[PDB]
Amino acid sequence: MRLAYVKNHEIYGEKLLGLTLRERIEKTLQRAGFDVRFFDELSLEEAEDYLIILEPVLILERDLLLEGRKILVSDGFTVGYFFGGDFRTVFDGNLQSSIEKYLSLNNLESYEIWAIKLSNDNLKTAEKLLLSSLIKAKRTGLKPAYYDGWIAREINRKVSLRISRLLADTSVTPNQITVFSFFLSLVGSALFLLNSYLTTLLAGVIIQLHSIIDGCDGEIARLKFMESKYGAWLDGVLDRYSDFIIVFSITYVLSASNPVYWIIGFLAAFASLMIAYTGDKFVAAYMRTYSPEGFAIPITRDFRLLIIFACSVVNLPSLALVIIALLGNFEALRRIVALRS
């Protein structure tokens, strides 16, 4: 057992994006493997490790790991104290004094964690930073199947985070967003079948909307601590259905004009599914996030859907199939070669 002692402050009672700052620090520290104790006056109980947090803080990092004596800091400011079990031998019933003594006996290295000290002044800033911590990027401490591609990071998350901000104050769940997003991909696919510029343009727009909103399920999951194994599985599975059905619809319409597009469609669908499969099979076999260093063809899902959108607005959905088939199949083969080392 590891104990996290958190000193009470009235500001913890304030709600930030659907949860009190109190439950936020509680849930983050629990995820980090600590039993939490809020206190006005500290009474020390037995544990292997002690984490002490005196000033009100919002922890933004996702995968906090605490091994060995350290002082936790955020931009030079002390966030909390991580003391060893031997703190018992020092504690004299006065917290202020006992910390002073323990620090004089030890030479604690400072350790940087992503956090923001809470004040009545800067909650708007806390909100902005909390939202920014929801993206799938190694910078946040998250450890997903794989991280956001460049389009996701610089285009799509900018929009979806603003949607998630509004959803945070509702009862909407991640699984509901995942299913709704899947449904949107079906609407887009149906629009392709109507075989006209107007509906093809609309299909493209709705597919890019789908791409954006598909980021909200993960954002809300992380934002309200509603992540689940099934949720991660379902989101991946339905994204595969979406990718296939979108290509199927475009291919089906085009095949009336030239049967050669069945071949291109087959290859585009295969490529789309295999970019996802090579990544998830990596996680399955290696038990770590898939995240290659250096060169890689940008043909992850955020790119594929943007390409479908762009080609659709100029009424050339056929071109999207060609690009995905080419780029996607080359990237899959490249991944095979690159991973051997």
276 binds a copy of itself (CB under 8 A): yes
Residue 75 known to bind ligand: no
Give every CB contact of residue 64 below 8 A, 6+ residues apart in sequence: 28, 29, 31, 32, 113, 141
Contact partner at residue 276 from ligand C5P, a copy of itself, Ca ion, none, CB < 5 to 8 Å by partner kind: a copy of itself
Minimum distance between the CB of residue 10 and ligand C5P, rounded to whole angstroms?
Answer: 32
Q: Looking up tokens 């910078």, which residue turns up?
A: 139
- Under DSSP, the state recorded for 264 is H
* DSSP secondary structure of 3-57: EEEEE--GGGGSEETTEEHHHHHHHHHHHTT-EEEEESS------SEEEEE-S-E
Which residues in the 113-152 window bind a copy of itself by CB under 8 A? 145
Which residues in the 258-317 window bind ligand C5P by CB under 6 A? none
The smaller minimum CB distance to a copy of itself, of residues 187 and 283, is found at 283
Q: Looking up tokens 């954006």, which residue turns up?
A: 212
Selection from 284, 291, 176, 194 nearest residue 238 by Cα: 176
Give every CB contact of residue 210 below 8 A, 6+ residues apart in sequence: 181, 184, 185, 188, 242, 305
The smaller minimum CB distance to a copy of itself, of residues 15 and 334, is found at 334
Q: Report the amino acid identity of residue 119.
A: S
302 binds Ca ion (CB under 5 A): no
Pairing of strands 19-20, 15-16: antiparallel
What does the alpha-carbon distance between residue 230 and residue 30 come to, in Å, rounded to a whole number?
Answer: 21
According to CB under 8 A, which one of 153, 278, 315, 326 is a site residue for a copy of itself? 278
According to CB under 5 A, which one of 26, 49, 217, 302 is a site residue for Ca ion? 217
Judged by DSSP in three states, 73 sits in strand
Residue 333 corresponds to which tokens in the numbers above?
Answer: 């083969």
Contact partner at residue 221 from Ca ion, ligand C5P, a copy of itself, none, CB < 5 to 8 Å by partner kind: ligand C5P
Q: Report the amino acid identity of residue 62.
A: R
Kindly tell me the burial class for residue 266, based on how many C-beta atoms sit within 10 Å of its own C-beta (0-12, 13-18, 19 or more): middle
What does the alpha-carbon distance between residue 2 and residue 245 come to, in Å, rounded to a whole number?
Answer: 49
According to CB under 6 A, which one of 15, 227, 252, 274 is a site residue for ligand C5P? 227
With beta carbons less than 8 A apart as the criterion, state whether 75 and 125 touch: no
Which residues in the 155-174 window bind ligand C5P by CB under 6 A? 174
167 binds a copy of itself (CB under 8 A): no
The smaller minimum CB distance to ligand C5P, of residues 129 and 234, is found at 234
According to CB under 6 A, which one of 144, 149, 317, 328 is a site residue for ligand C5P? 144
282 binds a copy of itself (CB under 8 A): yes
Q: Which residues bind Ca ion (CB under 5 A)?
A: 214, 217-218, 235, 239
Q: Which residues bind a copy of itself (CB under 8 A)?
A: 145, 229-230, 232-234, 236-237, 240-241, 244, 248, 251-252, 255, 259, 262-263, 265-266, 269-270, 273-274, 276-278, 280-287, 332, 336, 339-340
Q: Which residues bind ligand C5P (CB under 6 A)?
A: 136, 144-145, 174-175, 178, 214-215, 217-219, 221, 227-228, 231-232, 234-235
